[PDB]
């Protein structure tokens, strides 16, 4: 149901800006994600650019921005880091600690200095004080959950032509094309306990609850900004049970709280999935086994009035799950872990519905249109369990 929205953000939160993974080797991670996701390299900051502290590669597709960063070892001169908050020692420990993982969830805000200030005044634990990067660009960080930080980035609307962040050199893509992913939809974190994680996070941002799924194996709650275009869910495990909670399994292998999955939206998910799946065999990402025709007979009954046989067929061929909503239709699919451990994975989706306008010809879509796959949980759990037992 639609939960009330008290529009209580403590600072103006515009939208997701980017995500940064602190890696063992940026070249490797960025390189694989670039062809695996169809996100050409767009900016860079490394030795070739005068940064001898860290190597950073920014991949982009539509409005999706993925930053991959790794520390140099010797001859490293910290003062040359394009990202002032970088810590070689911290990064090195991060990589050994979790393998491939998300370090920063960055949101564009009206003013990074005021967002930090209002955040710390409301309990946020500071991670990196506000600094100017140049051209009206500001950055600040506070602790989100575990060793993941919530990063604030602000700049004049007129500076949006910047490749990424000051200090980053733009990279052109002439012999390059994307697969259709356009934006981050939601970023989910796993914590040992929801309430305290939620109280701290909602308490310093003013973000409100948009949705919740409670019980197997987990309790989830989605937090959103005023306009609800920024969605940050949190999961906690449910103890006891039969098999170990999939949430606990992550905390165990990951070694603590962290980003579990990131949902990436496409406006034509079928075209996008075909491109990704064509790359699976040679280093790309793999997807969860497609459900069986029974599941799909069910989608014909559940939503045969929005998808066409040739579409539902495509869905079954790729392994896409389909959910219906009081006001929208959701197509979603999950990849297998993108790193060495069964921790971080990706979700690819497309939302159908909830379109409206704002005195302009551009028709915007309501955030979270179609839900989060509540109807598919049953199947998702069965696919996960089966694969689990399959791993014995």
For the four alpha carbons of 346, 36, 256 and 55, in that order, the dihedral sign comes to negative
Residue 323: both structure tokens together: 């959910």
Backbone angles phi, psi at 78, to 5 degrees: -35, -40
Q: What is the DSSP letter of 71?
A: E
Structure tokens at 76: 């490293």
Please tell me whether residue 181 binds Fe ion under the rule CB under 5 A.
Answer: no
Tokens of 350: 């497309």
How many residues are there in the chain?
392
Site string for a second copy, 70-89 (x = CB under 8 A): xxxxxx--------------
DSSP 8-state code for residue 337 = P
Contacted by 24, from Fe ion, a second copy, none: CB < 5 to 8 Å by type = a second copy
Q: Is 237 in the site for a second copy (CB under 8 A)?
A: no
| Position 64 contacts a second copy (CB under 8 A) | no
User: Which of the listed partners (Fe ion, a second copy, none) does 347 bind, with a CB threshold of 5 to 8 Å by partner kind?
Assistant: Fe ion
Task: Report the alpha-carbon distance of residue 380 to residue 323 in Å, rounded.
Answer: 12
Query: Which option in a second copy, Fe ion, none does residue 25 bind, with CB closer than 5 to 8 A by kind?
Result: a second copy
CB nearer to Fe ion: pick between 81 and 265: 265
- Closer to Fe ion by CB, 263 or 312: give it: 263
Is 281 a binder of a second copy (CB under 8 A)? yes
Minimal distance, residue 87 CB to a second copy, in Å: 14
In this structure, the number of other CB atoms found within 10 A of the CB of residue 75 comes to: 8
If contact means CB under 5 to 8 A according to the sort of partner, which of a second copy, Fe ion, none does residue 361 touch? none
CB closer to a second copy, 364 vs 387: 387
Among 8, 340, 355, 382, binds a second copy (CB under 8 A): 340
Does residue 207 touch a second copy according to CB under 8 A?
no
Closest of 31, 141, 125 to residue 86, by C-alpha:
141
Q: Determine, following the binding rule CB under 8 A, whether residue 337 of this chain makes contact with a second copy.
A: yes
Residues 347-366 that bind Fe ion (CB under 5 A): 347
CA distance 326 to 392: 39
Compute φ and ψ for 141, nearest 5 degrees: -140, 150
Distance of alpha carbon 190 from alpha carbon 197, whole angstroms: 10
Beta strands 148-154; 101-109: pairing state: parallel
Q: Interhelix angle for 293-303 vs 309-318, to 10°? A: 140
Q: Give least dist CB 261 to Fe ion, A.
A: 6
Which residue, 172 or 355, has its beta carbon nearer to a second copy?
172
Listed residue (204, 201, 237, 238) closest to 222, CA to CA: 201
315 binds a second copy (CB under 8 A): no
Structure-token match 């199947």, residue found: 379
The region of 5-13, 40-48, 260-268, 363-371 touching Fe ion under the rule CB under 5 A is 260-268
Q: Would you state the structure tokens that stand for residue 265, as one six-digit string?
A: 């939206």
Give the C-alpha separation, 333 to 320, whole Å: 5
| Cβ 37 to a second copy shortest distance, Å | 9
Site string for a second copy, 158-187 (x = CB under 8 A): ---------------xxxx-----------
Query: Minimum distance between the CB of residue 169 and Fe ion, rounded to whole angstroms?
Result: 30
- Output the six-digit token pair for 99: 């393998």
Q: How far is the CB of 218 from a second copy (least distance, A)?
A: 20
> Is 389 one of the binding residues for a second copy (CB under 8 A)?
no
Binding site for a second copy (CB under 8 A): 23-36, 38, 40-41, 46-48, 50, 55, 70-75, 92, 95-100, 173-176, 252-255, 279-284, 337-342, 391-392
Binding site for Fe ion (CB under 5 A): 263, 347
């Amino acid at each position: 149901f639609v939960r009330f929205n008290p529009r209580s953000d403590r600072f103006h939160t515009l939208a997701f800006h980017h995500v940064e993974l602190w890696c063992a080797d940026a070249a490797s991670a960025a390189g694989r994600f670039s062809f695996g996701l169809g996100a050409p390299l767009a900016a860079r900051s490394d030795l070739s650019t005068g940064n001898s502290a860290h190597a950073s590669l920014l991949l982009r597709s539509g409005s999706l921005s993925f930053l991959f960063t790794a520390p140099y070892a010797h001859g490293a001169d910290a003062a040359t880091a394009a990202l002032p908050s970088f810590s070689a020692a911290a990064a090195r420990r991060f990589a050994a600690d979790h393998g491939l993982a998300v370090r920063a969830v960055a949101l564009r805000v009206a003013d990074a200095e005021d967002a930090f200030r209002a955040s710390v005044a409301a309990g946020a634990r500071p991670a990196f004080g506000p600094v100017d990067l140049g051209r009206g660009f500001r950055l600040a960080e506070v602790e989100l959950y575990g060793d993941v930080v919530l990063r604030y980035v602000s700049y004049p609307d007129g500076a949006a032509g910047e490749p990424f962040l000051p200090g980053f050199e733009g990279v052109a893509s002439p012999g390059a094309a994307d697969y259709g992913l356009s934006r981050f939809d939601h970023i989910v974190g796993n914590v040992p306990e929801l309430a305290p994680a939620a109280a701290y996070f909602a308490g310093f941002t003013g973000f409100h609850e948009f949705a919740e799924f409670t019980t197997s194996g987990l309790n989830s709650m989605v937090l959103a900004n005023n306009s609800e275009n920024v969605l940050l869910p949190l999961n906690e495990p449910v103890h006891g049970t039969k098999r170990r909670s999939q949430i606990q399994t992550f905390l165990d292998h990951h070694g603590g709280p962290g980003v579990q999955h990131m949902a990436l939206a496409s406006d034509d998910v079928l075209r996008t999935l075909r491109e990704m799946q064509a790359r699976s065999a040679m280093g790309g990402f793999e997807f969860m086994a497609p459900p069986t025709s029974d599941y799909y007979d069910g989608v014909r009954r559940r939503a045969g009035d929005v998808l066409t046989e040739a579409q539902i067929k495509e869905c079954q061929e790729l392994g896409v799950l389909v959910d219906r909503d009081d006001q929208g239709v959701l197509l979603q699919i999950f990849t297998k872990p993108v790193g060495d451990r069964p921790t971080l994975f990706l979700e690819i989706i497309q939302r159908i519905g909830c379109m409206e306008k704002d005195e302009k010809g551009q028709e915007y879509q309501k955030g979270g249109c179609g839900g989060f796959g509540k109807g598919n949980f049953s199947q998702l759990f069965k696919s996960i369990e089966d694969y689990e037992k399959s791993l014995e």
